[model samples]
Target chain A: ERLTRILDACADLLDEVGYDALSTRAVALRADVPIGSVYRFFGNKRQMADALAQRNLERYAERVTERLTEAGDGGWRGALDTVLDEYLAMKRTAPGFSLIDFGHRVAERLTELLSGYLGRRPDDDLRRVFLVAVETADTLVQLAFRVAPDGDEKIIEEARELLRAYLGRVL
Target chain B: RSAERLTRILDACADLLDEVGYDALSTRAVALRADVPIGSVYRFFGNKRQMADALAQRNLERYAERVTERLTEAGDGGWRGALDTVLDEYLAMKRTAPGFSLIDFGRVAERLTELLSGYLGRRPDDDLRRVFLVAVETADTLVQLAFRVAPDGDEKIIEEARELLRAYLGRVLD
Candidate 1:
């Protein structure tokens, strides 16, 4: 679909300009499609923006859905570590995420969507557990570069531990 | 003569705020700026705090009026848009309306946040609901911060603000 192409183009542009300066015109040009087409598929910049947000979230859902089931062959800690590792890695690897203007909205939406899936399980305090895991991801992902300027190795490790502790305490 | 002088006095108070920001604003300064006697300034406005509050109220009314206009234009987005419109308007206010920093002031902020929250208190869970108050405030603060600071193009601040808020809100709503 053209919408798929438009999203592809947006992802391409996001790689170039980050989320702050990305524009409809830029997405169109990068996609090698018409500007009007972008607008036609999405009503406005905000709609397009929200779509981009949804796109990232969809990707997150796809990754985490599989992880949820496969999460345990190694017991609860292994499952948590695997899930946390996969979740953080996905967000870190997403190329288009930087182009999002309301980055928080995207993060929140993704977490909310993910929580809905996870919250159904009877064993965990889904509310607190979900937030602490998400916060750990966002805080560490964000502050990692700052905390360890050499690389994100240390912060990512710390984030893993925190998420592990959070899951342990909450569940 | 007194009315003419009073207009000049208030106008000068407005000017001083624009030039110096909230912290430096004072009625004594207003008197000096307006060429009115300090005694007359005291008689008219009472004190620096009083004068600032009046100015802040005037600005707040102007801001609220703009949001009210935009409120009806928002359609299917529901109160999501309504609240977001108000959020955007407040963000605009903090930038274009200097007096909104009165929002950060002790008594002034408490009064305004409470009033705005109360008026919005009836919104649905995602709207102005109990848990949403803090979310609204958190999002509002982030929007304000996003608008206030110059973007270095990193997207770091906005990203942090968004996720932290979503994380907080998702918990509350759950």
Candidate 2:
């Protein structure tokens, strides 16, 4: 419970003050704990940011799982779309998600998820493909957000087409 | 007063990052390269990361200055032509610039989008800021990947980026 509160405070602070201005003392205060309590979990705001990002990563997986489960007969394109769709949803809704998304190695999150969906063995080639694809899409979508802080739909469509064309060749 | 010394420090930092890579780079080497005391390196920068940003900011500034210079020489090529020139501009730097990691490219992308806008007018859904940013982010990744494999210039990925750019933009821009 305390951990959740601290992380929540960090997320809220990041959304407001951004990564640079955020401090553990402020996070502790916001979480209604002593300043040392913040140190109990995170060495600094940098690690706090990492923990927040890892939390967001797990939340993303759970969201995608739900998205995939409901997207019946969604097709390979549909599966791909859900990955992006869930990412977009998280980008819009999650607190402090924008900066946290800057962190990578995300291929691990994506590789097995799609491999299971395709009923493949999570083979070397499959993981390699998604590693490139996920990172590629992640860069583009983040750029789109930077283009329009409000997030532009047309830019989103461009990524969909790019991903579709790339994945279409294989799928 | 401080500007002269700072530039040497940054120039040394840049060459060191290019030669030794960021992981192995240190204040001692930067100081040696600049012929400045190690304390002088700290005077200008608190850490290696700060030194990196100082370099990235200067590098990107020079990069944008070059693109603006060439764009003037070529006149407004409109979106189609200016678009490719941006690639050419990048290749020029990828060859001339010290290293790949020195980047503050979001601003570069925004600035590119602004220049490219003068070639066209009005909006269907919105302006080309979104489109140009799309190109910038995608191209930045592919271009870096290209360099990682072949430092002299990876023609294969360069054309692949061009192909992808043309296909995507052909759908939107005239």
Candidate 3:
């Protein structure tokens, strides 16, 4: 429980500060845990970070599984749009998506989870859906960029529509 | 006074980031590249990340300044016209000093989400933010295809990217 709290705190610190700003000492400070406890619990900062990310992903998997199962009788196309919108909505609204989605490995894990949940099937359409997910990561990054305080106003709306169309055709 | 020196250091970091990338960059490297002393590096900035943040900010400012300058001078383009005019001008800039990570589409995605959520915290329409997001993504893709990378992707790629973006914005916003 203590480690869990520490991990959560570290995740928040990483999000606000970026990867380079993160340090085990800093994590301890932010988490209100002893500095020695942090190093003792995890051999290093990366190990702690990896463990936290893995935990969050496990939570993500559980939520997505529920949503996917509830998608009920919708078939692959339905699942496709559901997942796309799911991602779009998350990108637009989720707080942690910024820090978590920054790395390539994070995305690869997302694909693995998605492919696994999608069953070990062999289908071109499924492959295309994966491609669209890859594309969404890029598109979402663009979206995040425009969200900058000084970013122009007109750009954001167009991106959403493009994503919608892009996802639609893929499905 | 200090800002000028800071800019020099930032440009040095930017150059190194392009030439060597993030992992290899160091205060020593930046000092060498900027031709400034080691102690001066600490005096100007906090650390490498802070330096990187400044570098990113400078890149954004430079690109925006060019686009805004051109857009204003071009005179009287509604949102769509403004979009095209700015993008075309951006393409021209990319043609010269090409920096991949300056406006990296892949890395910035996550940051964008956080940035947007905070920026548009209470907003309702959010149309402008969304469209700009799409336009930059398309523009980045087009620019990367045309200028960067192997076999040197065709001009058609840039054109298609531009056209697709224009259409995407036009339909969404208008």
Candidate 4:
């Protein structure tokens, strides 16, 4: 419970102050916990960021599961769209998620989840293919957010189309 | 005289970027390295971002020139060869160029996108520019991933990029 509050405080501070300005003391102050508590829970800022990234991945996976379930026999392309839409929705609203989405840990988590969703065995080729997909999404999503806060539809469409075309041959 | 001094300052900036990386870089430090007054740094650069952007622009120009030569020499081996040539030269830069990593290539991508749009606008396909822009963005991501793992690049990952782009171009190039 205390750990959750501290993580929550970090997320809130990320939204308020962004990554560069964020400090552990700020998280402690916002969480109404002592400064020592922040270090006890997380060794340092990067660890805190890593935990937040892990939380973001969990939330992202849950959303992906929910959306994919509702997608109703749609193709992999449809599943891809759902993953991106849900991610962008969270990104625009969730402060810490956007900031920490670039973490390598998050990318690894996303690759694993994305590979399973696509029904690929944990083989070398499947992992490589899915890693490419995650890299593609990361690039274009960052570009989309760079151009617009809500993520531009045209850019997103291009991203989707590019992935669909690539995955067709690879997968 | 002023132009020569400007080149000196920019060279110092590049050297300093290699020595200290981006976070420690400052106009004052650059001035000290170049042995010029800080005013000259401001007069030429305005600020650090502009300085980095200028370096990035120079790097891009050099890269664009080399890739053009490489592709022309490679003839019509098409997109795979083109991709290889571009990635090879990029890896070369990452290995050799001082301060190349310090410059934010996100801004450089905007410029390259415009350049590619112009180049592809003359091509037969109607969607040429858009497709090429996507290609560049994809290569940028994979190249960054390559460097993230190793100083030069991981060979397997680079091959994966080659195959991925080949797959992508198969769908788009026709």
Best model per DockQ: 4
Clashing pairs in 4: none
Task: Give lDDT tens digits, candidate 1, residues A100-166.
Answer: 5223444345445454444444323453345334544654555554545432665565455545544
Candidate 2 lDDT over residue span A1-171, tens digit each: 988999898888888898899889889999999998888888888888888888898888888888888864646788888888888888888888876753525777677666777766676556555655675687787767876886667778878877776665544
Q: Number of clashes in every candidate structure?
A: 4, 0, 18, 0
Cα misplacement distance, residue A86 of candidate 1 (Å): 2.5
Model 2 spans with C-alpha error above 4 angstroms = A102-104, B1-133, B145-174
Q: Candidate 4's residue-wise lDDT over B93-117, tens digit each?
A: 8778788766634244454455443
Docking level of model 2: acceptable
Give the range of the ten consecutive residues with the poorest summed lDDT in model 3 chain A: A149-158
What fraction of the genuine interface contacts, i.e. the true contacts, does candidate 3 reproduce? 0.21
Q: For candidate 4, what is the DockQ?
A: 0.55
Would you list the C-alpha lDDT of every candidate in the order shown?
A: 0.57, 0.75, 0.59, 0.75
Choose the strongest candidate by lDDT: 4
**lDDT by residue for model 4 over A1-171, one digit each (tens)?**
878988899898888899989999999999999999888888899999888877887888888878777763646677677777888888887768777764545446656666666676667776666677788888888887787877867778778877887777777
Q: Where is model 4 more than 4 Å wrong at Cα?
A: A32-39, A66-75, A102-104, A110-119, B1-16, B19-53, B71-82, B103-132
Model 4 error, position B68 (Å):
3.5
Model 2's TM-score against the true structure = 0.65
- Candidate 1: give the TM-score of chain A: 0.75
Q: lDDT score, residue B27, model 4?
A: 94
Docking category of candidate 3:
incorrect
Q: 2 or 4, which is superior by DockQ?
A: 4
Question: Looking at candidate 4, what is the lDDT of residue A11?
Answer: 90
